Design a protein around this nucleic acid. Sequence first.
DNA 1: TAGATCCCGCGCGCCGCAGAC
RNA 2: GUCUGCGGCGCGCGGGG
Lengths: 407, 408, 919
Amino acid sequence: EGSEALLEICQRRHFLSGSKQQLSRDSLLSGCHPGFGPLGVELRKNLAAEWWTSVVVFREQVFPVDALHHKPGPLLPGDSAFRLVSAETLREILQDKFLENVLKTSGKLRENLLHGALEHYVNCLDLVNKRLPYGLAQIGVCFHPVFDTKQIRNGVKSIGEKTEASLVWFTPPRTSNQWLDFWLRHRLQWWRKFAMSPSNFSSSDCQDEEGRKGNKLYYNFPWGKELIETLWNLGDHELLHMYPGNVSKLHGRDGRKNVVPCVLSVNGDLDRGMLAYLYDSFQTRKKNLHRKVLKLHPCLAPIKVALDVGRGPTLELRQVCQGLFNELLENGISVWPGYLETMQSSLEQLYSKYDEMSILFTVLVTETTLENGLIHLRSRDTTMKEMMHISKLKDFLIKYISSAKNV
Amino acid sequence: SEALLEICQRRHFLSGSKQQLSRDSLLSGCHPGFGPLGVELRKNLAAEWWTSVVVFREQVFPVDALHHKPGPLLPGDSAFRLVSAETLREILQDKELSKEQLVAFLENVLKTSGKLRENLLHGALEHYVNCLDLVNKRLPYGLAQIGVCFHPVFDTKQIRNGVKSIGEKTEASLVWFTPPRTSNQWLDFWLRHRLQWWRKFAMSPSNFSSSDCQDEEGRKGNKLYYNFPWGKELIETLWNLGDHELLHMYPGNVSKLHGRDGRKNVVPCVLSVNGDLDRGMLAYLYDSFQHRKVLKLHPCLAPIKVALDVGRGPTLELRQVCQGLFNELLENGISVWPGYLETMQSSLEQLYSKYDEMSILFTVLVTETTLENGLIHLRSRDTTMKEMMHISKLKDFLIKYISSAKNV
Amino acid sequence: MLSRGLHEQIFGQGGEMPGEAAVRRSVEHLQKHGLWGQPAVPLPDVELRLPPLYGDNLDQHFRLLAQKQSLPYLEAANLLLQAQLPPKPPAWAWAEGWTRYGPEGEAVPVAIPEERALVFAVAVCLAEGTCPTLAVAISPSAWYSWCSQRLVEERYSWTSQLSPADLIPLEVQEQLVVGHNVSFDRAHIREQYLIQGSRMRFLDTMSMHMAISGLSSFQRSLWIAAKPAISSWDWLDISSVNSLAEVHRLYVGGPPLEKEPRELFVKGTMKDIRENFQDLMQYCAQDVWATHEVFQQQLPLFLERCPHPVTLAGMLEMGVSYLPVNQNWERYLAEAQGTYEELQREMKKSLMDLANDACQLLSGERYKEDPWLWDLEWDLQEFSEEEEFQQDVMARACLQKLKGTTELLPKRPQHLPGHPGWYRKLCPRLDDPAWTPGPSLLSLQMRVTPKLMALTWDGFPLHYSERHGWGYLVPGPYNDVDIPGCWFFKLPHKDGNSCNVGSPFAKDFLPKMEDGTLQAGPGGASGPRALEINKMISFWRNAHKRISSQMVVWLPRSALPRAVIRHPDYDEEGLYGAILPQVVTAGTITRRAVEPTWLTASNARPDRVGSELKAMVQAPPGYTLVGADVDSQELWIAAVLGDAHFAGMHGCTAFGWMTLQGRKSRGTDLHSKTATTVGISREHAKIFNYGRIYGAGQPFAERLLMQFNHRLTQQEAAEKAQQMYAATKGLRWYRLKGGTESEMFNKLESIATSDIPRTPVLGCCISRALEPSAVQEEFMTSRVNWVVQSSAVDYLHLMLVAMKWLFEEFAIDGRFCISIHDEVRYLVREEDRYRAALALQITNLLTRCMFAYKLGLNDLPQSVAFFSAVDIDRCLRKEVTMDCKTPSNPTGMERRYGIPQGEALDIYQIIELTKGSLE
DNA sequence: TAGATCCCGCGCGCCGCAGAC
RNA sequence: GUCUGCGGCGCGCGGGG
């Protein structure tokens, strides 16, 4: 009814998502989609960059860490869901004699990346001189099992992919509560940033079966609230579990006292958040506006400005775009390279195409640009066109983006 | 030449215990991950690759390739690094076997569940059609992606009979679809550009080299080696594989995988460029080494640009200026190591030696003279001349230095 | 017992002469109006052992208690009254500390003044915060000066307790202090922020000025104006406006006090104070002298106008309030300000988005048909393979240069041509004034924001054409109230809202968002949220100035008592502080205390950012707040006054019958049961009922009913006379307000026009300016409000003196009374906290009985002889079991759950060893 | 009842200083 | 020089408790 169905058109169509005619919300939410389009990849990259800048940059005592996509083979208790079947049907044991069937002593793909961070804690303690309050951040893909729950329609469990960004913060036990509240507030504000309707990013409190507390952040999709980020206060249970040999090596210095740190893990789903921002950017009844457009935030839109030409008496003078394009390519302003299709596309269709692609500004070079150069600049937020001058464009765009970065 | 791995282990350039990474097992991915400095160096290298290959070409776009290929009824002829490759419980290669009805070819095994990718070409070949739809059928264009790939490891006995291992390599891949005519010209163009890019950050570019190789699957091939001190490893590979692989995919239908070149419909020829960013980082870190122990990484690749510190003076009324400078530098996008909050007042010479071993472009020291007239101390990484300079202009000097280093 | 329900008593004579005629009249009056037959549910009998009373009655008991409390300070006041003032010193000293100025201007440095009585004044410079800068005091011995030690150039950055002055001797006994706005001075005296009580008490000449010939709020507009409009003008020669100069001129015969024109204190710097040390010191000494003169002239007037000693003891006890915070106050102020900022940004972002979306209607002149934005401008004004091309021009075709113009680009000559005129006005200049993108400079207060948001009521032309938001806004030229708009406006009409701005018309759209024809409509995404954000924000928006900048003093570790040690909550890097409410003991026409940010009717309410202000009053470890709210104070007072005018038994006038028998739940009480059923609105009737016992008029009732919902004048209080016909049946004649209905308010009028003190309980006098004898006037409503509020403040004083007496009788560590809107809270140590509750209940036994002792009464109903409950908490809040909105939850703060007690407290005894539990 | 008025905050002018056509 | 940008200075009208 125009919500979550008219948006998917102009997504796979504008290559913000992998185009196969999926048209499944559950597939996107589960991570079984074929993939993201180049615009979707750029949007996810921008979102990851913003997360990195806000979490580990502008924040001392936070450092990067890499966790492998797979874990070692042996010393791996537990087993997969479908591998745990021995009820019946043992007629054929014709095979002579790791191998076997009890988990085969085989490695596993990582479901969460906090295990790698917890492993890396001891090595990452020397760079802070054992100062307790400090974090390890990482963005990486996580592999999860998912199924339709229809008999065995797909047979083996389907495998879903989700780009998770995790920060594992080691804090003194005494200061755990206020640090948890501060991280919850900061993450909620960050999510509410870049949002046309920040109220849709809600938060709630939850408790573990061990009594540990945490918070859950949700985005209000048109069908209902969906989880995006989870903060948990592990309380050094797993950190001590993985190091049972001795605690002297594990003691870090807080203030003037040696203590075992408490662990707080905050894990957010970048793909679900990217879908949430896509939904938020799009707008219903008796609006009297029309004009479909993705009003993504300038700080994370995939393409900033679109270059074009029009009514050019000389296409040899189209070289004016070149260099200017290069001028925008310096200092990291991404540009949609137009003025190349050489098609009889009216201005209205081009404007609609750029609006649906979340392009902030449309720059048009006309015949009156060779003398006293003026380039028609149209804005995505409001459909009005300026004149401006060539030499001031780059700084202006920078200033615009800079002004969008903060307030 | 030797004693370098110890310097890597210290300062967290390579994460691991005492001599676990060792000499071998670094060429393959069967080793513990990198330290924070190593991760940041990898990120900088990947950013440089992306800037040189993707953004500056205006016809190369990112592509999203999944780490797994479900492959309904996958063919039985492949490397099969992960025959299961489903959620947990990867059963490796498992050659032969699977004779019993339990875990037979049907259901699990026989690569029916899926596989874990070992190259980035397949995802690009799958997104080929959609990316033409995006480009509007203009034949010459590319698809780039940086991602992890999984390979099998052999020999290097771990326990008794070889148990194998998932060698993980962060590879940067470009798949370039160009018309069959002048495909060799595009091959030479990309070879020259990639070699120039690899030599751009090299302190001694003579080590970087190239060689030619011929095979039957591709018309021509090039290989970049760097000539590591022990020998010539392989850091990059370029293959003119041909339109044949594109034909195997989408076997049915016709006039679907061809595009417009010169107002003529032609089935494209594909070139595969594949560079090892892990081995590239190892190569750059090796060449940066050189009789003080200093890592002369390129300014555009160094993980940490500048570092702040306090020299004597009162403990208070100095953290304010350092914090302000730190905030300004980070607001301007320059990575800074906050050494001002370090306690215990480590030895000045030892501090400088440690800071040099970490490959920091400039060491900034703040004293009471800053409170008097705002003049910080500044030491260069390689020239080791100490000079006085104004605190307000430090950001401008640093960004100018980075820009000058970037330009040749 | 029995007799329609009375209490059990252990004091008072037998007596019991109800009178057959009086009982018959009561019965026959009860047959009509409320029902007579009602067995009801008698309450359990309670037997208690009160402590020994003094005198033959309880009136003499309270008199003796008041004299005992007030003698050590009355002696000091008398000493100050007859003291002889030596001449002012010629030159004021500059040395740090306290300097005494003996005769011939002899300056001697001393540690502290050893004086039993003085007049104090402290001045502050706002530049370096609120720290005091200079002080001058006088005493019967000599003069004293204090330079605040600010002469040194040293940085402290607030957060200190040594900054204020020092006036309490260690005595290792009375310490009366007088002044004008003495609460502000005692904020800069020190040792008043200590958790321990002190024997120093403060008197504020403003509270003797409000009590003696005070000025009404309505009368203030005519008093300033002359420094059916016919009225007398005989009252302007006896009243002032509470300013020091006017009060001194009225009460003391002398030249007008000069005012310093520079006013370096409010706008200046410490350098200016150093340069202007002498003149400012002289001005401060002049103010102190003026205050001393007013106090001397008013003290015998104060005793004469309040002959009962209890009033002075009550003012003495009221003047010492205490509000600990314990490091959460400044933390509470940062969170509230942050939330305010984010909501302002979010609502600001919504308005900009609405403005951007509003640009689309110019694409085809679609704004002409828009009912919302039709009248705006929308006026747009026009007025080597790669080397060959790798560089090329290299500077974006540098051949292009700026030819002509170069004026429009800078500043705003050609500000954004092509855009709408209004959008152009909104946007800032392109580069210079810290350019921010979008239609910034847009805020709630501009005339265009309603045009972009809300536009409800079928119209919302929020224009300033002498009518504000225009509209007939009801059924029945064309397009006067039609939905599409585009009105011709051939002849303007202010229909519907005929009053225009004549009414007070204040804060009426905040509750009209909930239904009330106040919403955005067609937008559906960002319109309503802006209104909802404004609803959350409005309180803090105009309260953050007062709530912030509250003078908090943090005590040092050494000054903490032994209560803090031995407790688990000790030294968690904890900063313990106290807020002095700075409350005038009497700041209105009556003796009711006035405080704009602590004595207001507000509590922790949802959807309000700045709510829960009363919370975060965290007691220190080892102490807790024991408090109680008086159940139906003024309603019961008016009912018992009417009963006493009517007969002896309380169930006689038929108003007290509903007050006693009626209950909130399953009862026909006047609050939310009777008046709501008679009226329309629900839960607003508890304001309409108070608006008749406080003595309003029918026009005010009609206006108040109008603010509840939209109705025409016929259904207002002009034809709908059912409330005024019943209840206060006024204008009753041919009977010699008097009689003929269930409420007896004629006693209040008789009290007002009797020329007595006109306080039926303790005999506190009325302001000279409002007396009919002094000036005949038709301000009956103000006078009846005066008497009822007088009874209220007379009730509060009685509780205060009783609680003080009960605390000083035994070894109870409970003091620091705090009075907020008929709710008394005390800070008491935990070890005796239950006892502190018990006494409070007993207080209501005597206080009510005192109201039942005068005016020829000797009995009281059983139910009203005790409090409903006593709240024993660790923080201040309306109810024990409540939460907060803006924070995550009350668990974020250190707010545990108390115990309202009730009947549990009554099982103990008033001795130190209760039921063997202690020791 | 009591109701509040300096106090911002938002609108109008008239008077001048500049400036390109 | 014009009404065209840029200042001062006055004037209204309304909410606050």
